[PDB]
Structure 1
Amino acid sequence: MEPVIIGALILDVHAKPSTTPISGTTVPGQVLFAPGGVARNVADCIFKLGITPFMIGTLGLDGPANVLLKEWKLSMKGILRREDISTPIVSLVYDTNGEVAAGVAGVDAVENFLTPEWIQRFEYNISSARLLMVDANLSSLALEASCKLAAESSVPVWFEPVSVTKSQRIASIAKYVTIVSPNQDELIAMANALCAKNLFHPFLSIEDMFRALKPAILVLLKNGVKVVIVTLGSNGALLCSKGNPKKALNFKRVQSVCSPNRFSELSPSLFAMHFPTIPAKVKKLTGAGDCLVGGTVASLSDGLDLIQSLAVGIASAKAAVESDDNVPPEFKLDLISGDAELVYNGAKMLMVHQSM
């Protein structure tokens, strides 16, 4: 009952300059191709963790597609290929700290050609999935078709918001969505989408960040999202759920060491925990959030609970920021396990002194 992953397959061009980029000219640096796209990365990540996902997406019959498919070891049955399709390309120029200085995304093939008509061919895979992961590169209509199919079979849906603009596609599907994984800005954009107004604004301690984000988080939850995971970069992640997180969504290494009886307080309408990350040496930050999703989905797919699974996701994200690839060539399970335990044992409840 494999997890089904639906969304963008993208050829990333990553330009890491040796010094500070300057308008009007080129600086020397390192320019690389990396297999990318949120859905492709998530599927890649899940597979490298020992779980087989089913990928649904679209590619051209062009050079970038060949690069993307060169080492592809999963089924391609879900991949729409047509000659009138241009394989999506993202070009990033980084700053010397590893943050994106300037970027252009050309991903219109996903919005235009990854259609309900293509996706509905796979109603069996979706309705029988352990979980459905959709990214926001899909058009609203594709998103609706996907999420309704999962929903009618009570298959939990993970919505990956992709960007501040695309995250707003939550608006027409929130009731069908079980889990979302925005960063701070995407969370605010999503809240504003669901409010149909620009009521919350973008942007220090964890309690402070949480107090700032809480109203926005509540907006998503009462619009039907059951779990909000707010990724905070080097500050880790927040896990907020409607109801107890263990029965809200509703490996052998991790399960033995990240005890499902560590946390006493495990049903409130807003449950909130902070997960720290682990000090890393960054080669490239791109693809960390995607590996957080991959690692979490893989663990959930193997029967771990959401607190354990997120710990694994955060371990996987750490491994990713230390690679030039979006997803590391390989994961080492002793490292992932070790890191997951650290994150997990370091995780804390928020709203401890509050009671509302």
Structure 2
Amino acid sequence: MEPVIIGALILDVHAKPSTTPISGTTVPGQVLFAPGGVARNVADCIFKLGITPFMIGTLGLDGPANVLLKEWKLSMKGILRREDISTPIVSLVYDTNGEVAAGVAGVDAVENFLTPEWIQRFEYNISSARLLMVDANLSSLALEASCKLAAESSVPVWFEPVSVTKSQRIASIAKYVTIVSPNQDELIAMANALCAKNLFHPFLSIEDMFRALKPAILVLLKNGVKVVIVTLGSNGALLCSKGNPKKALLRSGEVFKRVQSVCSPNRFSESPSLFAMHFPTIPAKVKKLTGAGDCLVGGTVASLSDGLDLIQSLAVGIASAKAAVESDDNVPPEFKLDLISGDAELVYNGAKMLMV
């Protein structure tokens, strides 16, 4: 009853310039390949926490595909591969402080070839899934078909917004989506999509940052999303939900055990239209920020798959995202459950109710 992950496998090109990138010209720097794609990163993170996901995606029969699959240890039954498909490539240029200065995504293969017809071959996997995660590299039609199959079996759906542009694909499926995980910029675009208007604009205290984002969050909840997680980079994450967050969504494995013992379900005092809490992250030595949000998703889905409640699960997601930033890859080579559970407790014990 594995979680099912649907979306892009992408070959990332990461260009870290040694000096400030200058318009019109090339500067020296470090340029590397890394396995990427939001759905792939999530699946990867889940796997490394000891849960086996089922990946549905598409790849070429080309060089970049060979790179992505070199260390692939998951099933490939769900991956559509054909000679006429061009493996997706993302090109990132960072600034000197590790933020994306410019990024271009060539993900045509996912929009054109990762179709409802392809996804429906795996109707069984989806209906029996503990949870379905779809990323926004999917076409609207692929998203709709996916979410409906999930709903028909009341399988909870996680929508990953991917980027400011693609996040607006929440629009055609919001009533089917259980959880979304945007950053501040994607949240705004998603709210504008669901209002069918450019009402909200992009951009300090945690409290003011929440008050700032609250209307946007409400637009998402009013349109049927049950849980909104807003990731705030080095400031952690907001958890907002329709009603009690624990009550918004085989026997447990080891991830459950350690975390269940130290992140007690009886930690928080005591339903409400808007529930909001802030989760801190942990001091980290940053090597590469890219993909941390994806590991937050994977860590959260892993914990949920293993039976943890949502609040305990997000604490693990944040621990996982910390491990990810402290690595030079999108997803760490490995996870130390020692540090993961320890950090999760740190995050969990530091969490604060917002509307008090």
Q: Deviations over 1:4-44 (max 9, x none)?
A: 00000000000111121122332222111100000000000
> In 2, distance between residues paired with 1:26 and 1:139?
34
Find the counterpart in structure 1 of residue 229 from structure 2: 229
> In 2, distance between residues paired with 1:157 and 1:221?
14
Q: Deviations over 1:89-148 (max 9, x none)?
A: 001111111101111111111111100000000000000000000000000000000000
Q: Which stretch shifts more, 24-33 or 69-78?
A: 24-33
> In 1, distance between residues paired with 2:161 and 2:269?
32
Give secondary structure in 2 for the equivalent of 1:314: helix
Give secondary structure in 1 for the equivalent of 2:278: strand
Give secondary structure in 2 for the equivalent of 1:234: helix
Give secondary structure in 2 for the equivalent of 1:147: helix
Give secondary structure in 2 for the equivalent of 1:112: helix
Find the counterpart in structure 2 of residue 334 from structure 1: 338
Instruction: Give, in angstroms, the shift of residue 202 of structure 1.
Output: 1.1
Normalised by the size of structure 1, how large is the TM-score? 0.97
Give secondary structure in 1 for the equivalent of 2:29: strand
Instruction: Give, in angstroms, the shift of residue 218 of structure 1.
Output: 0.8
Q: Deviations over 1:176-212 (max 9, x none)?
A: 0000000111111111111111111111001101111
> In 1, distance between residues paired with 2:24 and 2:202?
30
Q: Deviations over 1:292-316 (max 9, x none)?
A: 0000000000000000000000011
Superposed CA RMSD: 1.2
Find the counterpart in structure 2 of residue 184 from structure 1: 184
Find the counterpart in structure 2 of residue 65 from structure 1: 65
How many residue pairs were aligned?
Answer: 350
Give secondary structure in 2 for the equivalent of 1:284: coil
Give secondary structure in 1 for the equivalent of 2:144: helix
> In 1, distance between residues paired with 2:15 and 2:328?
11
Give secondary structure in 1 for the equivalent of 2:267: coil
Find the counterpart in structure 2 of residue 86 from structure 1: 86
1:252 aligns with 2:257: yes
> In 1, distance between residues paired with 2:279 and 2:158?
19
Structure 1: 5+ residue stretches without partners:
none
> In 2, distance between residues paired with 1:111 and 1:323?
30
Give secondary structure in 1 for the equivalent of 2:245: coil
Instruction: Give, in angstroms, the shift of residue 215 of structure 1.
Output: 0.9
Normalised by the size of structure 2, how large is the TM-score? 0.97
Give secondary structure in 2 for the equivalent of 1:246: helix
Instruction: Give, in angstroms, the shift of residue 278 of structure 1.
Output: 0.8
Find the counterpart in structure 2 of residue 262 from structure 1: 267
> In 2, distance between residues paired with 1:220 and 1:277?
24
- Kindly, what percent of the aligned residue pairs are identical? 100
Structure 2: 5+ residue stretches without partners:
249-254
> In 1, distance between residues paired with 2:224 and 2:80?
31
Instruction: Give, in angstroms, the shift of residue 337 of structure 1.
Output: 0.6
Give secondary structure in 1 for the equivalent of 2:246: coil
Instruction: Give, in angstroms, the shift of residue 317 of structure 1.
Output: 0.5
Give secondary structure in 2 for the equivalent of 1:273: strand
> In 2, distance between residues paired with 1:164 and 1:31?
25
Q: Deviations over 1:206-234 (max 9, x none)?
A: 11011111111111101100000000011
Instruction: Give, in angstroms, the shift of residue 251 of structure 1.
Output: 2.3
> In 1, distance between residues paired with 2:194 and 2:18?
42
Instruction: Give, in angstroms, the shift of residue 324 of structure 1.
Output: 1.3
> In 1, distance between residues paired with 2:26 and 2:139?
35
Give secondary structure in 2 for the equivalent of 1:164: coil
> In 2, distance between residues paired with 1:245 and 1:4?
22
Q: Deviations over 1:306-342 (max 9, x none)?
A: 0000000001111111111100000000000111000
Give secondary structure in 1 for the equivalent of 2:247: coil
Instruction: Give, in angstroms, the shift of residue 174 of structure 1.
Output: 0.4
Instruction: Give, in angstroms, the shift of residue 152 of structure 1.
Output: 0.6
> In 1, distance between residues paired with 2:80 and 2:129?
20
Find the counterpart in structure 1 of residue 167 from structure 2: 167
> In 2, distance between residues paired with 1:119 and 1:170?
18
> In 2, distance between residues paired with 1:322 and 1:33?
18
> In 1, distance between residues paired with 2:266 and 2:226?
22
Find the counterpart in structure 2 of residue 147 from structure 1: 147
Give secondary structure in 1 for the equivalent of 2:308: coil
Find the counterpart in structure 2 of residue 219 from structure 1: 219
Question: Of 296, 315, 326, which aligns to 1:292?
Answer: 296
Q: Which stretch shifts more, 53-62 or 27-36?
A: 27-36
1:304 aligns with 2:323: no
Q: Which stretch shifts more, 5-14 or 209-218?
A: 209-218
Give secondary structure in 1 for the equivalent of 2:28: strand
> In 1, distance between residues paired with 2:297 and 2:16?
25
